[PDB]
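Newbie here. three chains, one complex. Structure please?
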Amino acid sequence: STTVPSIVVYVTVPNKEAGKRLAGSIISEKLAACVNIVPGIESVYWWEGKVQTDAEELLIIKTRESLLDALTEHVKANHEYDVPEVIALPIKGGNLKYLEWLKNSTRES
Amino acid sequence: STTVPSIVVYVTVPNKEAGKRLAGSIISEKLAACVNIVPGIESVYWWEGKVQTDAEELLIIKTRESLLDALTEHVKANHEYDVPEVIALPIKGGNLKYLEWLKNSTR
Amino acid sequence: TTVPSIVVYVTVPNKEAGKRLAGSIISEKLAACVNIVPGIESVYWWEGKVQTDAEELLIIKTRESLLDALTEHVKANHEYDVPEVIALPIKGGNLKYLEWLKNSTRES
């Protein structure tokens, strides 16, 4: 049909510039239809025996399940951290016409 | 069975008034139990031969799977773009009383 | 290398509740990692009117396994008596991150 299986991928980054550049390569390389950047996140995790807290930005990446591999590759290749967060969540339904656009926007995999 | 299959729906909108109103209109019309508005989000995508970027906000809408078509029709009717982002994600539980109030406060 | 995991959305009513609940969450070994999204605005129906209040959003990355522990932990340290805690199924990613996620949390 019109309309490949899709996902929403969260990826966090340390700063504003990083976020904007990653969104550019993702979209230019045609690995996602669309990227929302949520600025001014604060992140909390346990590392080196204390609780750590860092200023970060969240990228919300609408794309194909197909490309989750090409995407995840791509985030690591382009990312200040060694273990960069990237997790996909499945899109089950939506505005049909947008999901088609999502398909046409995206690399063939 | 005090609990119906539920979704998180994402909708971007182009400005602060817009989403405030979409949200009002959505909730009023009983098409979702609630809407979180995330403001100041930047959206990047490919459009007319290059990398467009727009200032928007994000509506995270918690409603029932049953209501996704009604909610998607509503969003189109009340939204500036022709092909608005509306995408659904399935909930695999959580606070059961939340999930029932979700059921209850929705049609 | 990798137990079934999830993202958990949870709103708190202010800057401070979030900092504190994110701490106490990560402190008691309950999720690998917590993102606070400040200054969101939450709109819902309540007592016959459209309510709007300012809030924050915790995005909580953990294993399905801890969902209930977590929920029950939040209800303990959460000033609302019916917190929004909903969960969406993680289904893919940095195989590495998922391992770190796994390797940062309990079983029960």
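Moderator note: The helical segments of chain A are 16-28, 68-77, 96-105. The first helix of chain A runs from residue 16 to 28. Thread marked as resolved.
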